[PDB]
From a paper:
The conserved ATPase p97 (Cdc48 in yeast) and adaptors mediate diverse cellular processes through unfolding polyubiquitinated proteins and extracting them from macromolecular assemblies and membranes for disaggregation and degradation. p97/Cdc48 forms a ring-shaped homo-hexamer, with each protomer containing an N-terminal (N) domain, two tandem ATPase (D1 and D2) domains, and a C-terminal extension (CTE). The D1 and D2 domains form two stacked hexameric rings with a central pore. Both D1 and D2 domains can hydrolyze ATP, but only the ATPase activity of D2 domains is critical for substrate unfolding.
Using the same dataset, we determined five structures of p97 in total: three SH conformations (I, II, and III), and two DH conformations (I and II). We imposed D6 symmetry on both DH conformers I and II and determined their structures to resolutions of 3.15 and 3.32 Å, respectively, according to the Fourier shell correlation (FSC) = 0.143 ‘gold standard’ criterion. The p97 DH consists of two identical single hexamers engaged in a tail-to-tail manner, with the two D2 rings directly contacting each other. The D1 domains of both DH I and II conformations are in the ATP-bound state. The D2 domains in DH I are bound to ADP whereas those in DH II bind ATP. The N domains of DH I are in the down conformation while those in DH II are in the up conformation, despite the fact that the D1 domains of both DH I and II are in the ATP-bound state. The main interactions between each D2 pair involve the α9 helix and the α8–α9 linker. The three conserved phenylalanine residues (F768/F771/F773; termed the 3F motif) in the CTE insert into the hydrophobic cleft formed by α6 and α8 from the adjacent subunit, with a buried surface of about 1200 Å2. Instead, the arginine finger residue R635 from the adjacent protomer contacts the nucleotide and the active-site residue E578, producing an active ATPase configuration. The pore loops in both D1 and D2 rings in the DH conformers are ordered and have stronger densities.
Author numbering:
A (entry chain C): 12 to 777
B (entry chain D): 407 to 464
C (entry chain D): 639 to 754
D (entry chain B): 233 to 348
E (entry chain B): 581 to 638
Write the structure that this text describes.
């Protein structure tokens, strides 16, 4: 329920829009219970409230045929409320209209072309009088009294918010026309419609910001101080400035902006004037938000800077932060991309204690960003945006914007044999014939370069239990170790045990350990962090050890999550194998893992899993209690599991229905999962060879014989047949020998209980 | 440390606010006094906020 | 560091006191004979006894949750009365859990180590 | 079509491959109002004088909207800030960042630069 | 070449992994397969190759 601030609070005065059947520029049409529940009177105006704080006042009709949740409006009100169809509008009765003496309406500079005259005096001067038309500062209205859209923009009005045109409302048209490009810049401001894939972070920022500003009495009466500093960190190009502009257009509080290099670009002794000016100006008007963009430019680590004026700037910022009071109602938030580069005096309590992580968006966020950016592109029906979002793997939102740009540029270039560069104008058929196809996206995705591939991903896996064949015992056992301390804490409170933190899987290579980890992460709906062998070896050769602490901090930040260390035996196998060098069984990286593991609080839901293909050479200090405890053996799959593996590895390809997979699973005994995947892959490769070699004959025969070329047949080879499996089954092999399995069985028997104690019974003594 | 305990109490009271947010309106101008005085922080709020907090002294 | 002090494996009375001390958090049933357990085990250390107690508590939690799933399924399948409002099926862990958990115990310390 | 054109184009390669040649070629080609910035010519002037030249360049190019600004030898005027030890150089880098971010889609100005 | 330089077949006290081949494996596991980059490696003596390269996905 951490998202309940996003809800719009459905109320009986909330109205969806509707199309106006009355073409008056400021008319709405509502029912009689709507005009009696709020007591809306005809002759006065309602108070409509739309998006981005833009409001409007309109005359009302008693048209009862409109539904109880809808309200009718034309394009002029859809501009003045800044809403499309399907948008909710708050309505309020407003009998509080105070009139004006002199107003001054202004035209638009490109709409006044054609016939200038004074079309104000011709059409629009007796048009507002005695119709009780409500005007407002910012009214761009369509002109239906004239022959076409020679529009005016109502700019100057003696009441600043709005008024109804009175006989006292005297209008003057002497002023200059309004520019077009400035209004086009005005029409494209940013709300929460522009941000996608960050619902949780937007909820947290709304809870931290929108609630203390609208209602200080809640926090005065409960006696709880709201925070002062909110820090946004993430990779570059994730839209931090976008969220800043969104909340800036959202709140209506007095917003101020500070650009970091704009502060550092000025002379010595001048930038501090700008900082003090900013804080004094924001403390002049108490509901304020200060945003500081690119904070790391103006306050780095003081050990790195060598100027003294920079240290003076940092100390000035610290003083102005600590001088802020609870009286001022001022929230100071800042955004950087390097959370470690900041001077750590800024991290302290009362300066910047709220950290919000704007991470890399996953596939659903990618789809939402693509739907936001591609709303103004003429799109063909071939285009599957979900396929693109599945294929775009390492892209932040700016990379997706560049992807859409390059797709549209390729769509331009395909017409460039018709498009003339040298002529002055372009024909409108060439203009409107543009339609971006799937080939454009498949080009631009092959061309683009994602700048986020050096990043650890924190995502919920999609691998279910159905992909894994069998293994119901360890399925129940992993549910017992993971799912119940999350779901049922109270049972562990009623008794007196603490849940274990660790599991070690061991067995032959390629039997499904990674799939089990991803499956239990999918079952408990937790995040997943994978660390492979080469990353541990990279830390071992480079002797870098703060990275392990950074890994455990990243896993702490995304709780609940599982944390999967693949191939723990890699450093031991690299240093000496089993026979070793002159050393022992401890090293640097596993030591740092043990230090971080003994120090984590168990009330967090971080669970640690380590896989091993060779369990004898593991450091025995890990197997102590309080660490990785439960040893789980994963054998080679049996017949039913091989059936399910062969079924799961073929859902992508179309197979023929006469293929008997149960016969295959009966024939293979010592195969692992990798061997079955190898068989399926060789079958698909043979099928592709057959298809291409058949199509070459089609091309050669249809070019050699132009006689008919009429039949237009289907594929020679769809839906791969039993012949390809019979050919591909020759090249299969058992990758795991018998002595290896014997070794795993012997290590499994070394973990046997005491040979005894079966049929242990208490004395039944009455 | 003591500042972490102050932040813990803050997050517990914020969770106690959020459990009533299905009744609490953000869009209206005032809040009813029954919604005001109906606030009572429970053990579930502390068990939430203690699972959420991050101690900087480990 | 001067005084060398040898600490051997615990005897019967010490195993009694270890099994008593490791169970003050959990509610046990009063028909459990801990002295019989301490008489049966010879080469066990303290970690082995703690392992036995932990496996017993784990089996008890499995029994409790598996019993409550039947309650949920039956009360949703049969909305007929739902009136009795009984207590827990498994409070106060019984001798059956110790008899099951005592199968998986083992001596973690061999004889040649003690000889050394 | 509602698609923003790019703002910054960076040319990189080994020395002597004709980057300045391509700059002069497009400069004679387009007929748009071309302006040139030489890096050491900016760094050669006094403190507080080079920023006047940068602001003069961007204001002059924003006076005439179909413009191209070329900045030759960019690495002389904006190195890595960990390597520089003067503060006036960091002021120049921050001035360049501010004038780049202050550029709008209204201005129709393309800023391209060449380094090696 | 690196394996032959460090110990030949009999080796020193180490194993079969090193620094440069590790960095190759790290960069190879991280490339997107939608790019058309294809990787070929030649060997005059294939027994002393690190067996971690011969896994699938490589
Ligand atoms: N979540 C998002 N939804 C929609 N558009 C986005 C999103 N994230 C990024 N973009 C687009 O990418 C641009 C990047 O905006 P910026 O805020 O400048 O990026 P940034 O996250 O601030 O990184 P830096 O360090 O400031 S360059 C935005 O202007 C949008 O056009
Ligand atoms: N039980 C299984 N169910 C489905 N696919 C499996 C199973 N076991 C192995 N595979 C397949 O065989 C390959 C092995 O994947 P992994 O889970 O990584 O194997 P592993 O047992 O974890 O040991 P590695 O990673 O191969 S060294 C993948 O291509 C899987 O699709
Ligand atoms: N592709 C080319 N075609 C014709 N002449 C070329 C070409 N590349 C280089 N040259 C010649 O080599 C000269 C080098 O020009 P420059 O642009 O100064 O070299 P550069 O690539 O800019 O390297 P630096 O770093 O600026 S010295 C040109 O003036 C031409 O005379
Ligand atoms: Mg930004
Ligand atoms: Mg040159």
């Amino acid at each position: 329920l951490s998202t309940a601030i996003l809800k719009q609070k459905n109320r009986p005065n909330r109205l969806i829009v509707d199309e106006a059947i009355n073409e008056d520029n400021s008319v709405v049409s509502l029912s009689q219970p709507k005009m009696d529940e709020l007591q809306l009177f005809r002759g006065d105006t309602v108070l409509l409230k739309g998006k981005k704080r833009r409001e409007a006042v309109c005359i009302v009709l008693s048209d009862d045929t409109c539904s109880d949740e809808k309200i009718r409006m034309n394009r002029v009100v859809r501009n003045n409320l800044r809403v499309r169809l399907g948008d909710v509008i708050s309505i309020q009765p407003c009998p509080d209209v105070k009139y004006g003496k002199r107003i001054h309406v202004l035209p638009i500079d490109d709409t006044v072309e054609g016939i200038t005259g004074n079309l104000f005096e011709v059409y629009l001067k007796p048009y507002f009088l005695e119709a009780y038309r409500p005007i407002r500062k910012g009214d761009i209205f369509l002109v239906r009294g004239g022959m076409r859209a020679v529009e005016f923009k109502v700019v100057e009005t003696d009441p600043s918010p709005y008024c109804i045109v009175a006989p006292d409302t005297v209008i003057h048209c002497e002023g200059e026309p309004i520019k077009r490009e400035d209004e086009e810049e005005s029409l494209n401001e940013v709300g929460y419609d522009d941000i996608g894939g960050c619902r949780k972070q937007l909820a947290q920022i709304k809870e931290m910001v929108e609630l203390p500003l609208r209602h200080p009495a809640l926090f005065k009466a409960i006696g709880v101080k709201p925070p002062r500093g909110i820090l946004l960190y993430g990779p570059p190009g994730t839209g931090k400035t976008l969220i800043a502009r969104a909340v800036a257009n959202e709140t209506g509080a007095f917003f101020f902006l500070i650009n970091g290099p704009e502060i550092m670009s000025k002379l010595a002794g001048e930038s501090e004037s700008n900082l003090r000016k900013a804080f004094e100006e924001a403390e002049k008007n108490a509901p304020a938000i200060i945003f500081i963009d690119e904070l790391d430019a103006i306050a780095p680590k003081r050990e790195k800077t060598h100027g003294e004026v920079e240290r003076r700037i940092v100390s000035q910022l610290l003083t102005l932060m600590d001088g802020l009071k609870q009286r001022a109602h001022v929230i100071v938030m800042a955004a950087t991309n390097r959370p470690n580069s900041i001077d750590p005096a800024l991290r302290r309590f009362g300066r910047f204690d709220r950290e919000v992580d704007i991470g890399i968006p996953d596939a659903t966020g990618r789809l939402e960003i693509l739907q936001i950016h591609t709303k103004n592109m003429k799109l063909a029906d071939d285009v599957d945006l979900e396929q693109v979002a599945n294929e775009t793997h390492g892209h932040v939102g700016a990379d997706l914007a560049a992807l859409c740009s390059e797709a549209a540029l390729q769509a331009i270039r395909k017409k460039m044999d018709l498009i003339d560069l040298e002529d002055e104008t372009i024909d409108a058929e060439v203009m409107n014939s543009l339609a971006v196809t799937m080939d454009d996206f498949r080009w631009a995705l092959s061309q683009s370069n994602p700048s986020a591939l050096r990043e650890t991903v924190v995502e919920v896996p999609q691998v279910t239990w159905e992909d894994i064949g069998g293994l119901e015992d360890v399925k129940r056992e992993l549910q017992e170790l993971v799912q119940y301390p999350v779901e049922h804490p109270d049972k562990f409170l009623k008794f007196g045990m603490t849940p274990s933190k660790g599991v070690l899987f061991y067995g032959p290579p390629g039997c499904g350990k990674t799939l089990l980890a991803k499956a239990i992460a999918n079952e408990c709906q937790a995040n997943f962090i994978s660390i492979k062998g080469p990353e541990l070896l990279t830390m071992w050769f480079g002797e870098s050890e703060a990275n392990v602490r950074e890994i455990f901090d990243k896993a702490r930040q995304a709780a609940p999550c599982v944390l999967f260390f693949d191939e723990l035996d890699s450093i031991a196998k690299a240093r000496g194998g089993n026979i070793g060098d002159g050393g022992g069984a401890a090293d640097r990286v596993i030591n740092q893992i043990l230090t971080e593991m003994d120090g984590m609080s168990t009330k967090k839901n971080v669970f640690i899993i380590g896989a091993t293909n060779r369990p004898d050479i593991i450091d025995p200090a890990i197997l102590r209690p309080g660490r990785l405890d439960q040893l789980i053996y994963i054998p080679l799959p049996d017949e039913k599991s091989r059936v399910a593996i062969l079924k799961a590895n073929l859902r992508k390809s179309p197979v023929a229905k006469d293929v008997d997979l149960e016969f295959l699973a009966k024939m293979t005994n010592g195969f692992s999962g990798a061997d079955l995947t190898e068989i399926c892959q060789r079958a698909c490769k043979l099928a592709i060879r057959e298809s291409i070699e058949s199509e070459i004959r089609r091309e050669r025969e249809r070019q050699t014989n132009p006689s008919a070329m009429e039949v237009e047949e289907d594929d020679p080879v769809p839906e791969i047949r039993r012949d390809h499996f019979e050919e591909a089954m020759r090249f299969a092999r058992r990758s795991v020998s018998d002595n290896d399995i014997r070794k795993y069985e012997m290590f499994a028997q070394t973990l046997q209980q005491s040979r005894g104690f079966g049929s242990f019974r208490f004395p039944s003594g009455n």
